């Protein structure tokens, strides 16, 4: 089997991407944030504290003939950005782009943090990291991909995120028309439960490539590119007037600037992030200070190849017995 679904930016900045997901019988379609940095499929639901729902579409398990309470199971998750959610668990039929999993754990939120409430466009998350990170207790549950894997034509999914435009998540096949040149594959460590890999270096604009190992995670659920302070300083030093602002929470730059590109290495291959991808616009409405899309990972504890990086590539998440990651230009 295979599946193919379009993923759409939630706003004009590509702050996140939503993908429609069918849950239950008859189908209830919710728009979920596909997150290769976590491993819970959770949704706003009829059980979510009413004051914490503000415009989201909810899953109502009582209206699904295939929903079953997973007795005794609870979940609770905290994300890198400080947001969180928790609740209980149902199993139900879940379909993405024509690919169907029966008995998928659907984690129903009883509580969500303010960031989730305030984002009316995201109805929940669909985790695509390794199932070892799943938070369901006392019986850990599998991700949608893990459940689908044996049925897929090939045990892979691909992320093809757009810049200010829709893109695609495919399951079970590699669309050879969706990228240019060849796909370069690179080793993955699953030791921390993430799609963790090592970039071979970077360049800023038309500058020389610096060969240096940068361990980080491929994370579709993180907006920006978070890299070591040395790398980030070298980038922003090429932008007149750019500075790190503790008050704003990172590097800012004059909105009048033309940003240089940023290249990262995948083995001997190179992925070029155009400068425009690094512009996250005014820090507040009407400001002439703009927020940078490349930020320091210092104090995160891990480097994160988030959407800024991933949307410059066609990315293969290869879930073979020994997982690997593939990157192609597009």
CA 249 to chain centre: 21
Task: Classify the C-alpha dihedral 45-18-177-214 as positive or negative.
Answer: negative
Contact 302, 286 (CB under 8 A): no
Alpha-carbon torsion angle 24, 16, 192, 233, nearest 10: 180
Which sequence positions are flagged as catalytic? 35, 199
Q: Are 278 and 252 in contact (CB under 8 A)?
A: no
Element (H, E) at 18: strand 17-23
Kindly write down the DSSP assignment for every residue of 28-77, as one continuous string: EEEEEEEETT---EEE-BTTS-GGG-SS---B-GGG-TT-EEEEEEEEEE
Q: Which tokens hold the place of 6?
A: 């379009």
Cα dist. 71→89, 90, 328 in Å? 8, 8, 44
Instruction: Tell me how far apart the alpha carbons of residues 103 and 79 are, in angstroms, rounded to a whole number.
Output: 25
């Amino acid at each position: 089997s295979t599946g193919s679904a379009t993923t759409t930016p939630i706003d004009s900045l590509d702050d996140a991407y939503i993908t429609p997901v069918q849950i239950g019988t008859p189908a209830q379609t919710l728009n979920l944030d596909f997150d290769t940095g976590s491993s819970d499929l959770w949704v706003f639901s009829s059980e979510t504290t009413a004051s914490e729902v503000d415009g989201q579409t909810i899953y109502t398990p009582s209206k699904s003939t295939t929903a079953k309470l997973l007795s005794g199971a609870t979940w609770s998750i905290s994300y890198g950005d400080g947001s969180s959610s928790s609740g209980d668990v149902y199993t139900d039929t879940v379909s993405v782009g024509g690919l169907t999993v029966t008995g998928q754990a659907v984690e129903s939120a009883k509580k969500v943090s303010s960031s989730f409430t305030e984002d009316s466009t995201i109805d929940g998350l669909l985790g695509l990291a390794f199932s070892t990170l799943n938070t369901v207790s006392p019986t850990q549950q599998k991700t949608f991909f893990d459940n689908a894997k044996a049925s897929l034509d090939s045990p892979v999914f691909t992320a093809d995120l757009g810049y200010h435009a829709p893109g695609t998540y495919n399951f079970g096949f590699i669309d050879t028309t969706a990228y240019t040149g060849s796909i370069t594959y690179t080793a993955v460590s699953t030791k921390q439960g993430f799609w963790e890999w090592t970039s071979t270096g970077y360049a800023v604009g038309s500058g020389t490539f610096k060969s240096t190992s940068i361990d980080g995670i491929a994370d579709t659920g993180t907006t920006l590119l978070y890299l070591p302070a040395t790398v980030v300083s070298a980038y922003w030093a090429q932008v007149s007037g750019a500075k790190s602002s503790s008050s704003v929470g990172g590097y800012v730059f004059p909105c009048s600037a033309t940003l240089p590109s940023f290249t990262f290495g995948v083995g001997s291959a190179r992925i070029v992030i155009p400068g425009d991808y690094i512009d996250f616009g005014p820090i507040s409405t009407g400001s002439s200070s703009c927020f940078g899309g490349i930020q320091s990972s210092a104090g995160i504890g891990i480097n994160i190849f988030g959407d800024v990086a991933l949307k410059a590539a066609f990315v293969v998440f290869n879930g073979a017995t020994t997982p690997t990651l593939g990157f192609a230009s597009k």
